Design a binder for these strands. Structure first.
Lengths: 93, 105, 83, 97, 95, 103, 78, 97
DNA sequence: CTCAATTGGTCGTAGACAGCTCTAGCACCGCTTAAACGCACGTACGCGCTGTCC
DNA sequence: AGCGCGTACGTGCGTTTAAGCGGTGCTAGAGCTGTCTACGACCAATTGAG
């Protein structure tokens, strides 16, 4: 009943990545779980970072440092490049 | 374009991510760039995983990614394995690995 | 109905299969008992947590969600069931 | 007649199950066990079949990981495989009780 | 100047309630302050997640209760539940 | 005062303040901070009791981190609660394994 | 610098750890593992420091790094 | 006379488990810290307290690692801990991959 | 010494909470046969040591 | 730690079990929705604990 899921978004991604490849229902499920997990971990870390800085307005910078904390360094580097590129585009828009 | 997923050039729902960040009480206020950044990082990670799992599926000669393939991908990449080292994936099983001690000489 | 001895539903060949996926070639006949023990303790912990969540929900049904939350609280996050 | 030498089948089995991903414990036994343990915590609890299967997936993956650690403990003096002392050791290294 | 707040005084009061003899070193006092903050963190976090799991807005005393029962060892949880019930009943006996 | 109203030493007011400011939820019911303060005072009492007893065992007029570490690690439940915690100047428990000692 | 973690210091630690007999190879292993450890901890701490725009790494930065690492330290503020 | 080799070792263990002060020399550790951090950021400063906290965490981590390693050695039935023991230890902890 | 704790009061809505159903989880039979059991068997790898190395 | 000892547990097989399917019945409480107001947040004015 109006259960939100990243199914459509993950589809879109996969159509970027391997449009010829389907995702099984359960595989999709797992990806949904993963996405929610990493969302919660990053957001919670950003929250604690915000607390430590007495900042009540989580900015992109809090997300950036949270990502640098959570992800291993190369994955973190790539995630940072993607995030800053996206924020740049959104800023130009 | 009207969406914040557009303008960001993202598939992931920037507005949904912003909603969740507000709804999750992670802060009193959530600056508009934070949802975009989080959404993009989400997307990137999903992409990286789906890439590795799709390659595993392909070499499994299967068009549908199944949890087998997600687990294979997540454990074959050391960095994903570090991100997910405590995670258990339903129906993932294990990487095929037999200790050399066990193999016949 | 009172439930008892169902620990024995962990049949020696089951523990063997698990040891196989675990990469164990040869298994001490002692392991099977200790393995039932460890499994019991683990289930105890996860079930206790899931039950406590159901109690807070006032729910009489243990749901998959409650087990997932228990495992995440245990630091053993399970994907595939929600949460 | 024909007989595989000791552990030949065991290796073939390991290859097998590392190829596959199904549940290795027989379901209904596990479900009954779960019900029993929960009854000790609280009578009259209904278990979603999914919730059971989740407990089973967790239990299996956990025990498989434990067996992995235990078999790693085998290593010294080219000692082979696993004994309860190994289990106890691995758990304590984890800091499990 | 920086008026950094701490639970120090309450830790000393409780010490004198358990041991009127002896004192506590400033180092051990700092460790106690840390421990207090950690337990407060863990419990409030648990209760937060319990609320979200139920979609409930309000962390009630019951959220704290179930959090304590999840977090602490069974005996320690038991006694903590006794203490919290006693304290809440006492508070609701006053106004 | 409210801790008065509850018989607590721990500050019900400041616990309520921290629960509000800590964004743990949209709202924090007035019973919650009382209960949590009581739990935070039963804890702390538990350990300060054990540490004072250890100080008696160690014949000391003041609790020092040694005594807290001893109390925490000797009590199996506190050691379960604090197994992933480390304590400044605490040291470790006496631990020598049977094969290391001489026969 | 790294060799500033002297052989006697490592002996003392392992003795606190209850080690009766030590292979000399343990010293370089200990140095390597300690280096890795510090690396991770300091990287997290600096990452808080960088976020705070500070040049001074504070005790709180170290505490928060350890709290992340699952190594929660009492003694310097929670 | 001569103390049979290994008899002072237990005595030292008894001392150093009695003692609780830090066992690495403060300045050499501090300098190792400053070096490692320089690799991540230039012109860094450390609070003395922050350095001591790092040293506390590092030492207590190392003590627990040595404990676990010792247990591995005993499982090897070895009195002498070895690099392979540390490797097995961390592996079971899942620190090293 | 002072500003964080405190109170009586209003607001308005969170969630109590009561009803309502029909999801799906309870029992249940019952046939099939994969898997469990148990027994035989044996050989290989868990026990042992004193050779020997520092 | 080489090599001896030896009996543990692997491979086998034959029998027994009950897991699984699945077909069928039942029902209770999961979850939905609708009504009310107890409640916590905000507030101004107040106090003294840290």
């Amino acid at each position: 009943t109006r259960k939100e899921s990243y199914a459509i978004y993950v589809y879109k991604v996969l159509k970027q990545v391997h449009p010829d490849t389907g995702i099984s229902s359960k595989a999709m499920s797992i990806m949904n779980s993963f996405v929610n997990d990493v969302f919660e971990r990053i957001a919670g870390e950003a929250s604690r970072l915000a607390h430590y800085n007495k900042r009540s307005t989580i900015t992109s910078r809090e997300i950036q440092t949270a990502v640098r904390l959570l992800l291993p360094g190369e994955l973190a580097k790539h995630a940072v490049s993607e995030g800053t590129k996206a924020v740049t585009k959104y800023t130009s828009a | 374009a009207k969406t914040r997923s557009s303008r960001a050039g993202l598939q992931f729902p920037v507005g949904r991510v912003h909603r969740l960040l507000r709804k999750g009480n992670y802060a009193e206020r959530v600056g508009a760039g934070a949802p975009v950044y989080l959404a993009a990082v989400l997307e990137y990670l999903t992409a990286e995983i789906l890439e590795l799992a799709g390659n595993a599926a392909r070499d499994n000669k299967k068009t549908r990614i199944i949890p087998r393939h997600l687990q294979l991908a997540v454990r074959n990449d050391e960095e994903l394995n570090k991100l997910l080292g405590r995670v258990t994936i339903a129906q993932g099983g294990v990487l095929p690995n037999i200790q050399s001690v066990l193999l016949p000489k | 109905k009172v439930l008892r001895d169902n620990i024995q539903g962990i049949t020696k060949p089951a523990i063997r299969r698990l040891a196989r996926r675990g990469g164990v070639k040869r298994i001490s006949g002692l392991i099977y008992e200790e393995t039932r023990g460890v499994l019991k303790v683990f289930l105890e912990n996860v079930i206790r947590d899931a039950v406590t969540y159901t109690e807070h929900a006032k729910r009489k049904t243990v749901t998959a969600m409650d087990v997932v939350y228990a495992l995440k609280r245990q630091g053993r996050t399970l994907y595939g069931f929600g949460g | 007649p024909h007989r595989y030498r000791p552990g030949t089948v065991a290796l073939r089995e390991i290859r097998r199950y590392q190829k596959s991903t199904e549940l290795l414990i027989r379901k209904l036994p596990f479900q009954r066990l779960v019900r029993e343990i929960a009854q000790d915590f609280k009578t009259d609890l209904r278990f979603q079949s999914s919730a059971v299967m989740a407990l089973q997936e967790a239990s299996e993956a956990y025990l498989v990981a434990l067996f992995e650690d235990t078999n790693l403990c085998a290593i010294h003096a080219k000692r082979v495989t696993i004994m309860p002392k190994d289990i106890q050791l691995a758990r304590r290294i984890r800091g499990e009780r």
